[PDB]
RNA sequence: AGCGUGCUACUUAUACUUCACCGUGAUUGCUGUUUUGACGCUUUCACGAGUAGGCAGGCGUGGAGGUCAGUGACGAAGCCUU
RNA sequence: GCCUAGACCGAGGACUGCGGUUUUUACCUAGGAUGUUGGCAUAAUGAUCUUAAGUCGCCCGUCUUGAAACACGGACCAAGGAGUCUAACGUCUAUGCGAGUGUUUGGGUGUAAAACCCGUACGCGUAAUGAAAGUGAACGAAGGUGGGGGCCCAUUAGGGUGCA
């Protein structure tokens, strides 16, 4: 720009940040999010897919399965804010979801043998309970879309 | 550097007014008053209805 | 090295321990004062209610004591004001729109408010309104500077010689107009309120009696301040 | 320096500090000392009273050399004594032997009487003295010797 | 008022008490009770229009 | 921010303040001049007129004089001129003068890379 | 908008530094800026303000003024402080032994202070032997004796000196200065 | 969708409230850690319209003393150019 | 007292304060945003220029109570173009010396219009006033009184000294 020299008192040391008092507190999920609830995915690859909610992960995400055989939606995570929580529920008391966590979905195409086996083990119980509700498998296998004259501010799900 | 409302920040409210703790604990904001069920207007104050 | 940093930290910890221990008693004092103020507020209300009921029973009429305190808000801009009401508004420290001040009712101050009446909205403030004003928008004049009332130490350092040690001491001194009302109200920077949520009436610059906004609204000043603070 | 003048700061402003109505006309009010008795009376009467009129008598061919008579007071008279011998004179002076101060030779015509002398005799040679100057000189035991 | 203030100051001092000499503006009146024995309220109404010419 | 960390750089006005009627007449250059006319629509600030320079548009003192990379730029005319930027290589950058020859310009570029000084005009 | 009760953006109207660019006066201000900020002594706050004054605001103090100030009761051994020049007075008959601190001394003043057994020190030497100005006595020169003040506030019946280049019977003595020539004011 | 009148909600100025930044005025403190800037740094508050006009701080030009042992025929100065 | 929907903002930058909870560097929502995930770095992101759309925008300068005016100059462009210098002064500021001050009229000297050096006079100041003849500034600690910064003695207060 001009001919103004830097001065000796112009230090280059970067100060440390102050000690922050933003101690994190737990997430507040919606009351409609109960394990076994049928959810509608609003974004992503599986947008419009009706899926089963299984577990609340420690990442603040929801563990979800189609089931994959019925839907094509595998075990994966979704965000609670990109989900419509319907009123349909499935009894998931017979499904063991203890082993599922963040490290299970760690990033390393090819699919792990473990993940396929876990898919089958979870989906067996999911299908056993789904068969009880008539048309529930058909409902889950069908994509969701907004028809003409559908007003989401008046509908109950 | 930043003014915090004691009416929003409970910690600042207790910092400014320590009695707020007792006010909250005793439910001073919804305290009942004990008295008898009376009606003292039966006599000459019925001059309000007509004259 | 950190020898000194840790040394001054230990010295600070000891001094802060002693300071907090000493301040605990003062905070007990102000706690007791606030509790006493609440007791006397409730006692006075029940006494007045009982007196009204008793006057109703004994074929009489209880006339309330006239209010001694008023909150005055300048709701008019700074243009086209005659010299005398302009000087009066300056002397109430109402030198901008939506500026509020506490005034102790006498004759001199009453004739002042009557002079500024076409330009202000005023009334009788309740205790909760006073508390809300002082808590959210309460500022003090310290060395001609506008300082937020964020700690009871500011109030003590400036009004302890007037026996005001807490924000509740200040609120009590305003509400029940005390022997040091002058010092407490001049220490209070004029409250700078926002515009009302919900608006004014259709036309401000006419008396409250005629459907406007200026003059004495008396108990509706609490609703108006609730709108604006 | 021209770079410091206010002429440089008015560049770009239309009227150059002279006003848009008043402007900088040639000679409004006249030239020099014009109008001193009619429309400049308010200036000359307030700040230079006595300007108009004659007072006193003329003096054809006044030679100021005639009136040369510089004044020296008494508080400055001992400064004419030699500096290296002032302290000795202030001690040993008596009626029998006092310093001689030739005031005319230092360029003074009249001795005036402001201030106070040391209570010490002096011999002052002057062309003129005031009444009080000689009274003060005699009081300290001194004398005035007239010269020309 | 100077003499009266001086008189008030000396006598409170005699009684070993205090007295306040600063003048005050007129203050709002206190509470009070209005007796209605012999004074039951009389109801008034605005009167109709008449011409008296 | 490869430079010393700074707040986000804010430029209050990014266009050029163009003199009034520098578009109507060729004799009127775009270099900003304040209108002094009695009737000027711009001097009286009518709605719809051009923006004018004022101190409110001044840059934040923490991001003032910083190029988009976060450095303050210093003009260098010879290799000895780089000596003043020795202890400020993370806060000051060097810009080579246009009239330095193609020979000396290569030498200036060579010393800055050894010293770690960043160069703002590296190709010309 | 604000209804301003005072003029906005008003400078204090007092000098906070010398107009002089003398580097050695700046050092003296350096010393008493620290002293006034840190001693709670009112003397140091007065000296700091006095070092800013302009030439006409620090009139010279004659060696006769110091003699009269030392002649106050109980002030014979006080330290005389003059923020300015101390000049000589050849109308004195005698001068005492005294300690005087000044910005400058004339040749006669230094000669006459030291001849009578006194000291002529600078203001920095004062700050070590009297860092709070203990046992000091500030002396100021006459401000209203300046010739320019003769013409200040001139007007009718004001008795001030006219702004005039020549003096004599022919120069502003006739009309308005004499009842025989109209009126006198 | 006119006239008189009442009510609920709503619209938006460079005005008001909270916050950020520029400048101006004031303000807190800063030398046994003053430490190669005290004509400097720093804490805090309030304020910002303007013709004629005053003052201040800066930008630019011809030439001059000093300095960069400065740039330059391996290209100065000038000129055109999202 | 409680629950709940949205928006905008995140200045500051080791620690220091007040609280609160005390789980007595135990923490905290308590003197200003952190944590975590994805994507991009041949780029999501940002600026300018041109242009479209929307909205607003009358020709500048001047004299003028009032100008876009049916008031005047101005078709366009380049270059030149207007508060200067001097004699004598008022106020203010800086500087040198100071009851004195000013070397530069002149003289000495010189590496030659410079720089360096010298002194008598003179100007102004140090005395005023009166038309003039003329006279010419201490009763007193160079005065008293009420204030008066600072300083001294004190011990809220109080006393002493008190320049401008
Ligand atoms: Mg299928
Ligand atoms: Mg008030
Ligand atoms: Mg407290
Ligand atoms: Mg609304
Ligand atoms: Mg409304
Ligand atoms: Mg309206
Ligand atoms: Mg309307
Ligand atoms: Mg009505
Ligand atoms: Mg509100
Ligand atoms: Mg210039
Ligand atoms: Mg200007
Ligand atoms: Mg102008
Ligand atoms: Mg023009
Ligand atoms: Mg002018
Ligand atoms: Mg003109
Ligand atoms: Mg004129
Ligand atoms: Mg005539
Ligand atoms: Mg004479
Ligand atoms: Mg720009
Ligand atoms: Mg122009
Ligand atoms: Mg026009
Ligand atoms: Mg106009
Ligand atoms: Mg070139
Ligand atoms: Mg404003
Ligand atoms: Mg104000
Ligand atoms: Mg005097
Ligand atoms: Mg004179
Ligand atoms: Mg006559
Ligand atoms: Mg209608
Ligand atoms: Mg604004
Ligand atoms: Mg302005
Ligand atoms: Mg130049
Ligand atoms: Mg030239
Ligand atoms: Mg040169
Ligand atoms: Mg930050
Ligand atoms: Mg992840
Ligand atoms: Mg457009
Ligand atoms: Mg014209
Ligand atoms: Mg005309
Ligand atoms: Mg005009
Ligand atoms: Mg006309
Ligand atoms: Mg017309
Ligand atoms: Mg005309
Ligand atoms: Mg004409
Ligand atoms: Mg024409
Ligand atoms: Mg032409
Ligand atoms: Mg044409
Ligand atoms: Mg002059
Ligand atoms: Mg010469
Ligand atoms: Mg002479
Ligand atoms: Mg002479
Ligand atoms: Mg006295």
From Swiss-Prot, chain F:
Keyword Ribonucleoprotein listed: yes
CDD domains, alphabetized: Ribosomal_L32_L32e
Entry's Gene Ontology molecular function annotations: structural constituent of ribosome
Keyword Ribonucleoprotein: yes
Any one GO cellular component localisation term in the record: cytosolic large ribosomal subunit
GO biological process: translation
Pfam family, one: Ribosomal_L32e
Domain of life of the native organism: Eukaryota
Keyword vocabulary terms for this entry: Ribonucleoprotein, Ribosomal protein
UniProt similarity note: Belongs to the eukaryotic ribosomal protein eL32 family.
Protein name per Swiss-Prot or TrEMBL: Large ribosomal subunit protein eL32
């Amino acid at each position: 720009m001009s001919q103004v020299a830097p001065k000796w008192y112009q230090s280059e040391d970067v100060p440390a940040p102050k000690q922050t008092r933003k101690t994190a507190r737990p997430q507040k999920l919606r009351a409609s999010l109960v394990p076994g609830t049928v959810l509608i995915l609003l974004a992503g690859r599986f947008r419009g897919k009706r899926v089963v909610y299984l577990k609340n992960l420690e990442d603040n995400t929801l563990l979800v399965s189609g089931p994959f055989k019925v839907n094509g939606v595998p075990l994966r995570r979704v965000n609670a804010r990109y989900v419509i929580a319907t009123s349909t529920k499935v009894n998931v008391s017979g499904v063991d979801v203890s082993k599922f966590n963040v490290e299970y979905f760690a990033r390393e195409k090819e699919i792990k043998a473990e993940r396929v086996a876990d898919q089958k083990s979870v989906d067996a119980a999911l299908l056993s309970e789904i068969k009880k509700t008539p048309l529930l498998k058909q409902y889950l296998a069908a994509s969701f879309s907004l028809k003409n004259g559908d007003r989401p501010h008046l509908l109950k799900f | 550097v930043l003014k915090k409302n004691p009416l929003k920040n409970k910690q600042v409210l207790l910092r400014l007014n320590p009695y707020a703790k007792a006010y909250a604990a005793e439910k001073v904001g919804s305290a009942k008053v004990e008295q008898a069920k009376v009606k003292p207007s039966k006599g000459q104050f019925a001059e309000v209805l007509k004259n | 090295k950190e020898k000194a940093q840790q040394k001054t930290a230990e010295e600070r910890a000891a001094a802060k321990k002693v300071r907090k221990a000493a301040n605990k008693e003062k905070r007990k004092v102000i706690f007791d004062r606030a509790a006493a103020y609440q007791k006397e507020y409730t006692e006075a209300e029940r006494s007045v209610i009982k007196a009204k009921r008793d006057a109703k029973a004994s074929n009489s009429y209880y006339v309330d004591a006239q209010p001694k305190l008023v909150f005055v808000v300048r709701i008019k801009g700074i243009n086209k004001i005659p010299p005398k009401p302009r000087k009066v508004l300056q002397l109430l420290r109402l030198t901008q729109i939506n500026a509020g001040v506490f005034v102790r009712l006498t004759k001199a101050t009453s004739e002042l408010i009557k002079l500024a009446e076409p330009y202000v909205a005023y009334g009788y403030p309740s205790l909760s309104t006073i508390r809300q004003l002082v808590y959210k928008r309460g500022f003090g004049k310290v060395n001609k500077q506008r300082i937020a009332l964020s700690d009871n130490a500011i109030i003590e350092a400036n009004l302890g010689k007037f026996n005001i040690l807490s924000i509740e001491d200040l609120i009590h001194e305003i509400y029940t107009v005390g022997p040091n009302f002058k010092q407490v109200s001049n220490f209070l920077w004029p409250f700078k309120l926002s515009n009302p949520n919900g608006g004014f009436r259709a036309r401000k610059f006419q008396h409250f009696i005629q459907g406007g906004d200026t003059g004495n609204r008396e108990q509706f000043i609490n609703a108006l301040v609730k709108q604006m603070n | 320096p021209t770079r410091l003048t206010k002429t440089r700061k008015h560049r770009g402003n239309v009227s150059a500090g002279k006003g848009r109505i008043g402007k900088h006309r040639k000679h409004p009010g006249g030239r020099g000392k014009a109008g001193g008795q009619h429309h400049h009376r308010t200036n000359l009467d307030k700040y230079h009273p006595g300007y108009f009129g004659k007072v006193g008598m003329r003096y054809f061919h006044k030679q100021q050399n005639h009136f040369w008579r510089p004044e020296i007071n008494l508080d400055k008279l001992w400064t004419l004594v030699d500096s290296e011998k002032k302290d000795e004179y202030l001690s040993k002076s008596s009626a029998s032997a006092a310093p001689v101060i030739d005031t005319l030779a230092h360029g003074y015509g009249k001795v005036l009487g402001k201030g106070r002398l040391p209570e010490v005799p002096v011999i002052v040679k002057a062309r003129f003295v005031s009444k009080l100057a000689e009274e003060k000189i005699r009081a300290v035991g001194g004398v005035v010797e007239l010269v020309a | 008022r100077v003499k009266s203030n001086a008189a008030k100051k000396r006598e409170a001092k005699a009684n070993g008490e205090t007295v306040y000499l600063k003048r005050q503006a007129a203050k709002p009146r206190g509470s009070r009770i209005i007796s209605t024995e012999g004074n039951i309220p009389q109801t008034l109404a605005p009167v109709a229009y008449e011409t008296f010419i | 921010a490869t430079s010393v960390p700074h707040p986000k750089i804010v430029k209050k006005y990014t266009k050029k303040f163009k003199r009034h009627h520098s578009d109507r007449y060729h004799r009127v250059a775009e270099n900003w001049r304040k209108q002094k006319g009695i009737d000027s629509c711009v001097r009286r600030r009518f709605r719809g007129t051009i923006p004018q320079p004022n101190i409110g548009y001044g840059s934040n003192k923490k991001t003032k004089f910083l190029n988009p990379a976060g450095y303050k730029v210093y003009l260098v005319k010879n290799v000895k001129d780089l000596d003043v930027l020795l202890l400020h290589t993370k806060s000051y950058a060097a810009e080579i003068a246009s009239s330095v020859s193609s020979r000396k310009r290569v030498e200036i570029v060579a010393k800055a890379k050894k010293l770690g000084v960043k160069v703002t005009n590296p190709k010309g | 908008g604000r209804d301003h009760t005072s003029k906005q953006h008003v400078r204090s109207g007092h000098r906070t530094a010398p107009k002089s660019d003398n580097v050695y006066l700046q050092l003296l201000v350096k010393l008493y800026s620290f002293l006034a900020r840190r001693t709670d002594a009112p003397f140091n706050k007065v000296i700091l303000k006095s070092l800013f004054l302009s030439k006409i605001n620090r009139p010279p103090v004659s060696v006769s003024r110091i003699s009269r100030a030392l002649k106050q009761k109980g002030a014979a051994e006080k330290t005389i402080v003059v923020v300015g020049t101390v000049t000589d007075d050849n109308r004195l008959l005698e001068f005492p032994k005294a300690t005087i601190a000044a910005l400058r001394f004339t040749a006669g003043a230094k000669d006459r202070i030291l001849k009578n057994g006194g000291e002529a020190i600078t203001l920095d030497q004062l700050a070590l032997r009297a860092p709070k100005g203990q046992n000091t006595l500030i002396v100021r020169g006459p401000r209203n004796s300046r010739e320019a003040v003769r013409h200040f506030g001139f007007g009718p019946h004001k008795g001030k000196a006219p702004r005039i280049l020549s003096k004599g019977r022919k120069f502003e003595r006739a009309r308005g200065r004499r009842r025989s020539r109209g009126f006198k004011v």
